Design an enzyme around this catalytic site. Structure first.
Site, PDB file in Angstrom:
ATOM      1  N   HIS A 262       4.005   2.714  -8.508  1.00 60.47           N
ATOM      2  CA  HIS A 262       2.924   1.962  -9.136  1.00 60.47           C
ATOM      3  C   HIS A 262       1.975   1.448  -8.048  1.00 60.47           C
ATOM      4  O   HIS A 262       0.760   1.671  -8.088  1.00 60.47           O
ATOM      5  CB  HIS A 262       3.475   0.761  -9.909  1.00 60.47           C
ATOM      6  N   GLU A 263       2.554   0.750  -7.074  1.00 52.85           N
ATOM      7  CA  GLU A 263       1.798   0.186  -5.968  1.00 52.85           C
ATOM      8  C   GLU A 263       1.139   1.283  -5.163  1.00 52.85           C
ATOM      9  O   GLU A 263       0.028   1.116  -4.657  1.00 52.85           O
ATOM     10  CB  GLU A 263       2.714  -0.633  -5.060  1.00 52.85           C
ATOM     11  N   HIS A 266      -2.380   1.937  -6.526  1.00 51.64           N
ATOM     12  CA  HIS A 266      -3.434   1.058  -6.022  1.00 51.64           C
ATOM     13  C   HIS A 266      -3.808   1.409  -4.588  1.00 51.64           C
ATOM     14  O   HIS A 266      -4.990   1.529  -4.252  1.00 51.64           O
ATOM     15  CB  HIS A 266      -2.976  -0.399  -6.058  1.00 51.64           C
TER      16      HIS A 266
END
Ligand SMILES: [Cl-]
Ligand SMILES: [Cl-]
Ligand SMILES: [Cl-]
Ligand SMILES: [Cl-]
Ligand SMILES: [Cl-]
Ligand SMILES: [Cl-]
Ligand SMILES: [Cl-]
Ligand SMILES: [F-]
Ligand SMILES: [Zn+2]
Ligand SMILES: [Zn+2]
Ligand SMILES: [Zn+2]
Ligand SMILES: [Zn+2]
Ligand SMILES: [Zn+2]
Ligand SMILES: [Zn+2]
Ligand SMILES: [Zn+2]
EC number: 3.4.17.19
Lengths: 497, 496
Positions: A262-263, A266
């Site tokens: 997920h990170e 970004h």
């Protein structure tokens, strides 16, 4: 142009305060000694107000004005940058510098307080700060002003244009499509064995995988790093330093995997915004929504795509042998994508995920239309989880204290996850036209085609385009929920039904 | 309201310092190499931000208004202003644009330095060492001096110390050490040091360093231990003093003495009167006084064979194969070995000073323009021969060895010798109130020793000057005699 250089010089000055600020925040989430907490909160407040001042300064305002009249003789980035600075001027200008400063200080303190509250599963420890964090925001909503719902004032801080009216109508359709879909998933004996998922998976090995997947997916370690944290997050110190953090759970390797990925989303975004925009006003994600479309694109539209696991399952099996011994690759993926209502948003399945956002959206919609007190929040929180997921949080840690967003003062943020999920769904399908061999790529462990697609459609632009233009230009159609609903629907009708 | 506005500027500086300290610490513990350039800029902006408050016209106004009103100010305020006035007068001589680019250069230069040392390539660090030296020669010009140009830089760390003073001071050292080493290097008493270079598991060493940190008094709710290339200790704020170390699995000594050394700085930083927190006075009295505490902990405790009595059990259990059937006696005899070597930071007590002197002279030659960057590696290797009889085979163990220069710390090195002397003097005098000192170490009871150091040195922060600290503590101004005697006696009983 002289006035131009004086303008960008100031932004680049802000840029540096930002790095110092982001480092302090990152440092506070990775080991900063508690004794230094108070002065740490003070310094973060000082450097933040510094940025605030450089943006509210009469000079900044004069430079804006001047550059607006000469608007035509300026390049695109400069136009967008000044228009962006103009809004930030008018916006901050409505807030007493003395208030912003103590608010920022309160956030730094609230988050350290929060980290402790959650770790102990103690609402009362956080409660005191939650009351102030809100009290401040209610007040801020006044200063900025609004047109319809006072909560829009906060929504506008992350998704310019998104209002309570626009969200109600959209979360309605999501309910209408997800909830019944989740009932069907519940009403079946097709429950896949998930016994091997909750076994012990050595931390040291999970760490190896997260780092590995990062490398595989394209996270540049020369411009970043991975570290442990209570609540995973990704932060940009400066264009060449975008850090990610994750959390390990030996009784669920999934948490680290999808959190890291997920990170990683970004980060990839941040590590690919045009370098020309670096040091300026436009070197940032188009909006939380578009930012979340990237994290969710990686976590969900890749990490949760069964072909993504074909090449990697061999590794997983070797990292924690006794656990996946004789488990079919097919069973593995079915286990991963198991949909069932659960308490933690961050760890929820793809189908039940949206409901979590909806719950938070509504609770916040209440908190800011003065319908609920800090004291009745846990009760309100727990009630919503029951209404939409049929389960009730038994502890504060899995309940209201679950996420760090409020502790950091981020109200009006959450809906961006929903939107982001929708954007991801729309970007994914449109991407198929150019990359039909999508699932094929994942099986070959080849991710540059996908990454490149996203870099040219979203990443590179940074803030040169607004969300609307980002999506319309990439798929040639405004944000449309149908895509997410179809993706989800189609995917969880085949696994169960 | 003037006194309030004054301290308000100092507290404003204090928050910028944390930011700077952190950015520095972070760059030595992980920061990505691609954010290297902007990182330098931010340190520069934040550093110049502190500079500007100290050089601002309003600060100068507040300075003067409080001086007129002097007699009514408190002891702290008086000293706070005297310090503010010194830094105002000092920094005012330097062009802001220049201090800013200088700070940025140190940040970038230190980054380039870590790599140069790692690849043992001087050419990579040379372009920077050229600029650093240039700025500083130019700074000497701005600040000005009386006797030697290097006196201006020496004054930055040890106000009152000059070339005249140090030449005489070191002169006595060479004379006492050099012959004393010849003796040690000439005796069939060479303790057996085979088990030292054995393999000591890094992961185990780390546990010990954390153990000793707890034991010696380091507060972990007020700090943390992390790894770095070149160990150091830094203060982000009063409640955040961090320490770092370097683990070598082929000589556990490096991490042990390295940590204990840093512990000294920390135990000191963690005991400066809290009232001075957030101010101008919450810092070490000077580099020498600080190195006096680190060296007291490293050498006067770490190297006093009694220290290992209560802990030798743990060292054996951490690496059993390595210290299996090695007498506690032989252990301490090997630890305090004395043989000339290349790395100051790892050098033994007897030869340590020679290392400092070599740097002192080299720097003295540098700023009196008696040598060029290009010729430094040569001159360096020469001095190491002149005083230690050995020549560096790689620039890594040679001139690239220490970081100070990359960090723009010229005129700092001497402070290690002064600190070592200060330590020797504090020690012998401490024996008066604590004769059972060696007895305490055997029990691992240090509170008596710490509290002594805290009342005599730490607590004061910058309220007292080094000259004041030492006189008030030992009863007499600094004296090399104590260090010479200490080393003289200690290493004569080991070999001779
Ligand atoms: Cl966070
Ligand atoms: Cl946050
Ligand atoms: Cl490839
Ligand atoms: Cl350093
Ligand atoms: Cl004894
Ligand atoms: Cl340094
Ligand atoms: Cl004894
Ligand atoms: F770190
Ligand atoms: Zn996210
Ligand atoms: Zn946070
Ligand atoms: Zn490839
Ligand atoms: Zn030191
Ligand atoms: Zn004895
Ligand atoms: Zn340094
Ligand atoms: Zn004894």
């Amino acid at each position: 142009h002289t006035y131009e250089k004086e303008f960008f010089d100031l932004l680049k000055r802000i840029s540096h305060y930002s790095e110092a600020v982001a480092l302090m925040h990152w440092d506070s989430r990775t080991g900063a000694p508690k004794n230094g907490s108070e002065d740490r909160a003070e310094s973060i407040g000082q450097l933040s107000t510094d940025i605030f001042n450089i943006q509210t300064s009469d000079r900044m305002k004069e430079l804006i004005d001047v550059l607006y009249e000469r608007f035509d003789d300026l390049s695109e980035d400069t136009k967008k940058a000044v228009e962006l600075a103009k809004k930030e001027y008018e916006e901050n200008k409505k807030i007493p510098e003395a208030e912003y400063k103590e608010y920022v200080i309160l956030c730094s303190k609230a988050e350290t307080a929060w980290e402790e509250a959650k770790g102990k599963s103690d609402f009362s420890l956080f409660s005191p700060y939650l009351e102030q964090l809100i009290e401040f925001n209610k007040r801020f909503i006044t200063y900025w002003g609004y047109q319809e719902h006072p909560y829009d004032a906060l929504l506008d801080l992350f998704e310019p244009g998104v209002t309570v009216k626009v969200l109600d109508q959209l979360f309605a359709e999501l309910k209408e499509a997800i909830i019944p879909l989740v009932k069907q998933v519940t009403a079946s004996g097709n429950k896949p064995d998930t016994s091997f998922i909750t076994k012990a998976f050595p931390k040291e090995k999970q760490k190896e995988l997260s780092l590995y997947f990062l490398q595989e997916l394209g996270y540049d370690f020369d411009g970043g790093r991975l570290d442990e944290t209570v609540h995973p997050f990704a932060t940009t110190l400066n264009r060449g330093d975008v850090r990610v953090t994750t959390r390990y759970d030996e009784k669920d390797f999934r948490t680290a995997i999808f959190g890291t990925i997920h990170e990683c989303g970004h980060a990839i975004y941040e590590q690919n915004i045009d370098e020309a925009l670096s040091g300026t006003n436009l070197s940032d994600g188009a909006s939380m929504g578009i930012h979340e479309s990237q994290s969710l694109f990686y976590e969900n539209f890749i990490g949760r795509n069964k072909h993504f696991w074909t090449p990697y399952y061999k590794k997983i099996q070797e990292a924690s042998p006794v656990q996946f011994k004789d488990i079919s690759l097919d069973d593995f993926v079915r286990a991963i994508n198991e949909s069932k209502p659960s308490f933690i948003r961050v760890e929820a399945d793809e189908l039940t995920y949206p409901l979590h956002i909806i719950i938070r959206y509504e609770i916040e919609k209440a908190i800011f239309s003065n319908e609920v007190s800090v004291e009745d929040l846990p009760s309100l929180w727990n009630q919503k989880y029951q209404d939409y997921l049929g389960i009730t949080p038994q502890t504060d840690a899995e309940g209201i204290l679950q996420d760090v967003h409020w502790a950091g003062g981020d109200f009006g943020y959450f809906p961006s996850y929903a939107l982001g999920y929708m954007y991801a769904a729309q970007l994914k399908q449109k991407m198929l036209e150019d990359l039909p061999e999508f699932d094929a790529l994942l099986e070959r462990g080849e991710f540059h085609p996908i990454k490149q697609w996203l870099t040219e459609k979203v990443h590179i632009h940074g803030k040169r385009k607004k969300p609307l233009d980002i999506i319309k230009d990439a798929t040639g159609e405004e944000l449309n929920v149908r895509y997410l609903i179809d993706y989800l629907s189609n995917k969880y009708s085949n696994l169960y039904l």
